[PDB]
Design a protein around this ligand. Structure first.
Ligand SMILES: CC(=O)N[C@@H](Cc1ccc(O)cc1)C(=O)NCC#CBr
Length: 129
């Protein structure tokens, strides 16, 4: 935990109201589970360690960091009120990658593959009930 990396996004706050929904259950059991085991998930399984990767400008450019390790903990620890909050975290993670990296780059192709899978699964997100 280098002082030069920011604290990770919040995964626990007892003041924030929490709810289990069937959609959130789907996001954990189907969407996260599927993306987590993809061959290209590893760069997205934890916050970007800008120290280790020698990217001192990362947290200069990316002011809303997000990663699937954070999303996994948010889903496992019922941090969310609704599915939109969680979908937004996934979208933020993909867009961070697209903003920071060049269109050709391996990391972008890897994010695009996870995003295509994500969209397939979110198209089947169940009606809330
Ligand atoms: C989520 C994300 O952006 N990924 C990291 C780490 C990473 C990059 C490429 C790769 O093949 C495996 C890991 C990163 O390097 N970010 C910007 C830059 C640069 Br150089």
């Amino acid at each position: 935990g280098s002082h030069m990396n920011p604290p990770p996004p919040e995964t626990s706050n007892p003041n924030k109201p929490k709810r289990q929904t069937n959609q959130l259950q789907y996001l954990l059991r189907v969407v996260l589970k599927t993306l987590w085991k993809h061959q290209f998930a590893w760069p997205f399984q934890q916050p970007v360690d800008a120290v280790k990767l020698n990217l001192p400008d990362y947290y200069k450019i990316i002011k809303t960091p997000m990663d699937m390790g954070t999303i996994k903990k948010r889903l496992e620890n019922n941090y969310y009120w609704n599915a939109q909050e969680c979908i937004q975290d996934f979208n933020t993670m993909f867009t961070n990658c697209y903003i920071y990296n060049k269109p050709g780059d391996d990391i972008v192709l890897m994010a695009e593959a996870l995003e295509k899978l994500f969209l397939q699964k979110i198209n089947e997100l169940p009606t809330e009930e």
